[PDB]
Structure 1
Amino acid sequence: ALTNAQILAVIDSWEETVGQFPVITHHVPLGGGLQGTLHCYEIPLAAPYGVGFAKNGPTRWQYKRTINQVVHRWGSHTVPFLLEPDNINGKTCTASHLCHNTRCHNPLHLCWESLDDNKGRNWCPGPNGGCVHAVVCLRQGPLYGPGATVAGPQQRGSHFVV
């Protein structure tokens, strides 16, 4: 099995490579009518992506290193968390974008949490709009707002009460 020192070396080579990705400045809603700035380190749109990186889906990538003649591979956003527990409350831990930008691999924009926690950040009002996430959001979720509901609760007769 890979030693802790070997895992730290994978994390270090991953950081070295991702740190050379293009850095894109984005202005983002924080909630409460305030605006902030995030700096995303974005994997390229097409090959080559960077040393060790390859695309396995439209917005999916993997990181690969060969150690002592054995090929090891990880989801490209999971590498910062290789020294962390991989489940919690019986749920698998997932890499969760606080910047809501899939191509971004900035580890300061990622956290490690259940898929439900991950998804729920899409609707959070944001760090200045009432976020209650213990690991605080970096921005208001892209789907926060009144929604676009087509039809509300209704009945034709009188068979029901709320």
Structure 2
Amino acid sequence: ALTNAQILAVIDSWEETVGQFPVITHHVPLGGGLQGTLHCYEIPLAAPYGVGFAKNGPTRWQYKRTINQVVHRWGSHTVPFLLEPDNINGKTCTASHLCHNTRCHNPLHLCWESLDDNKGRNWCPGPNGGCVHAVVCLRQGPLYGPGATVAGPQQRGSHFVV
């Protein structure tokens, strides 16, 4: 098994490589009518992506390193969390984009949490709009708002009460 020192070395090489990705400045809603700025380190749209990186899906990548003749591979956003527990409350931990930008690999824009917690950030009002996430959101979720409901609750007769 990889030692803690070897895992730390993997995280360090990953950080070195991701740190050289193009850094893109994005202005984002924070909630409460306020605007903030995030700096995303974005993996390229097409090969080559960077040393150790390869695309396994339209918005999916993996990181690969060969140690003592054994090939090791990880989901490209999971590497910052290799020294953390990988489940909680019986749920698998997932890499969760606080910036809601899939191509971004900035570890300051990622957290490690259940898929339900991950998804829910899409609708959060944001750090200046009432976010209650213990690990605070960096921005208002992209899907926050009144929604676009086509039809609401309704009945033709009198068979029901709310």
Q: Same fold (TM over 0.5)?
A: yes
Residue 131 of structure 1: CA displacement? 0.1
Q: Deviations over 1:50-98 (max 9, x none)?
A: 0000000000000000000000000000000000000000000000000
C-alpha distance in 2 between matches for 1:110 and 1:155:
45
Q: How many aligned positions are there?
A: 162
Residue 113 of structure 1: CA displacement? 0.0
Provide the secondary structure at the position in 2 that maps to 1:95.
strand
Residue 10 of structure 1: CA displacement? 0.1
Provide the secondary structure at the position in 2 that maps to 1:133.
coil
Residue 5 of structure 1: CA displacement? 0.0
C-alpha distance in 2 between matches for 1:53 and 1:142:
28
Residue 124 of structure 1: CA displacement? 0.0
Q: Deviations over 1:4-32 (max 9, x none)?
A: 00000000000000000000000000000
C-alpha distance in 2 between matches for 1:158 and 1:145:
32
C-alpha distance in 2 between matches for 1:157 and 1:22:
60
C-alpha distance in 2 between matches for 1:114 and 1:25:
28
Residue 115 of structure 1: CA displacement? 0.0
Normalised by the length of structure 1, the TM-score is 1.00
C-alpha distance in 2 between matches for 1:50 and 1:96:
22
C-alpha distance in 2 between matches for 1:117 and 1:82:
19
Residue 122 of structure 1: CA displacement? 0.0
Provide the secondary structure at the position in 2 that maps to 1:126.
coil
Q: Deviations over 1:100-148 (max 9, x none)?
A: 0000000000000000000000000000000000000000000000000
Which blocks of at least 5 consecutive residues in structure 2 are unaligned?
none
Tell me which stretches of 4 or more aligned residues in structure 1 moved more than 6 Å.
Answer: none
Match of 2:43 in 1: 43
Percent of residue pairs identical: 100
Provide the secondary structure at the position in 2 that maps to 1:63.
strand
C-alpha distance in 1 between matches for 2:33 and 2:82:
37
Normalised by the length of structure 2, the TM-score is 1.00
Provide the secondary structure at the position in 2 that maps to 1:27.
strand
Structure 2 matches for 1:71-90, cutoff 5 A?
Answer: 71-90=71-90
Provide the secondary structure at the position in 1 that maps to 2:152.
coil
Match of 2:30 in 1: 30
Structure 2 matches for 1:122-133, cutoff 5 A?
Answer: 122-133=122-133
Provide the secondary structure at the position in 1 that maps to 2:15.
helix
